[PDB]
Design a protein around this ligand. Structure first.
Ligand SMILES: Nc1ncnc2c1ncn2[C@@H]1O[C@H](COP(=O)(O)OP(=O)(O)NP(=O)(O)O)[C@@H](O)[C@H]1O
Ligand SMILES: [K+]
Ligand SMILES: [K+]
Ligand SMILES: [Mg+2]
Ligand SMILES: [Mg+2]
Length: 313
């Protein structure tokens, strides 16, 4: 931390206690939140930010560099051949991909299946030139359980059918039961602490994402307040995926209001989610994921199934 211009081991011991220990946390901070710290002046704060953006090389980039930045984004397999395809390879890190859909369409299954596929190194697709082996070594997931539907059994079950060891997944997956939007938001904010303690968090799950905000901000004369609180949440979730190069998955419910339906969460959720899906039930265990929004990929459908082994085909 003293590598930073104008940073005595004091101002450093201070920054660590205030949470800022990473050059990025500091490079992407504001001169206001940084001065909120004691002996940290304005020029002191202004200087270490400029210095960290610098050390981290956050300037203008052109040509081949645009490709090298893009190559830093690894991807997680959904165990579905078709879903990965439609996903442009798999679930991307540095982005928030959402799965919305009717009850029992498999949203939760996808969240569990992921926590498992993370513990299998051959399910993390990356370019060894931009993503080192150590950067994805001993990955860990973080399952923020909103509905109260996390199921250890299911994690164990999906683990064997894939050769993986069940306890091994449970030992590397942190679960946080949130009973309201408050606990929900705060848990997501406290993922930074899990990292500061050496946990290679490479997967974040919010299931469900909107349930809480709706039960709380009922009156739609309160919806302004909601969309506001809900916008900072999505912001935190994205900075996370960006800064810790991990994938952020979230599930969402569908509103009756008119395809036919639409994911709840309002505008803010739409703008904030990078990849948006609509999952449907088919005959028996046949399911369909429909990609309707993304920045570079074309809308498309993926067929898979939900069996005792999890997601397959
Ligand atoms: N062990 C299992 N073997 C086979 N199928 C299973 C198993 N466990 C769950 N399922 C299937 O998973 C389906 C439900 O998927 P699930 O992801 O839990 O719903 P959801 O998408 O989260 N819907 P919702 O709760 O409304 O948000 C069930 O109805 C079962 O057919
Ligand atoms: K249900
Ligand atoms: K539910
Ligand atoms: Mg991003
Ligand atoms: Mg569910």
């Amino acid at each position: 931390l003293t590598d930073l211009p104008g940073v005595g081991p004091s101002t450093a011991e201070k920054l660590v206690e205030a949470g800022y220990i990473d050059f990025m946390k500091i490079a992407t901070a504001t001169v206001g939140e940084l001065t909120d710290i004691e002996g940290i002046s304005e020029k002191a704060a202004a200087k270490m930010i400029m210095g960290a953006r610098d050390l981290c090389d956050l300037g203008f980039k052109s040509g081949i560099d645009l490709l090298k930045q893009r190559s830093t984004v690894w991807k997680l397999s959904t165990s579905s051949s078709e879903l990965d395809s439609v996903l442009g390879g798999g679930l991307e890190s540095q982005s928030v991909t959402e799965f919305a859909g009717v009850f029992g369409s498999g949203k939760t299954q996808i969240m569990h299946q992921s926590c498992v596929n993370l513990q299998n190194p051959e399910f993390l697709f990356y370019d060894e030139e931009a993503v080192s082996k150590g950067e994805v070594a001993q990955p860990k997931a973080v399952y923020i359980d909103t509905d109260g539907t996390f199921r250890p059994e299911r994690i164990m079950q999906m683990a064997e059918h894939a050769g993986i060891d069940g306890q091994t997944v449970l030992d590397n997956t942190f679960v946080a039961r949130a009973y309201n939007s408050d606990m929900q938001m705060l848990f997501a904010e406290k993922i930074e602490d899990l990292i500061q303690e050496g946990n290679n968090i490479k997967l974040v799950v919010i299931d469900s994402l909107t349930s809480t905000f709706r039960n709380e901000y009922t009156g739609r004369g309160k919806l302004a307040e909601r969309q506001q609180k809900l916008g900072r949440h999505m912001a935190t979730l994205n900075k996370l995926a960006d800064l810790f190069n991990c994938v952020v998955l979230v599930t969402n419910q569908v509103s009756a209001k008119p395809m036919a339906e639409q994911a709840i969460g309002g505008h803010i959720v739409g703008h904030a989610a990078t990849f948006r899906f609509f999952v449907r039930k088919g005959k028996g265990d046949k399911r369909v994921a429909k990609l309707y929004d993304s920045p570079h990929l074309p809308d498309a459908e993926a067929i898979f199934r939900i069996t005792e082994k999890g997601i397959q085909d």
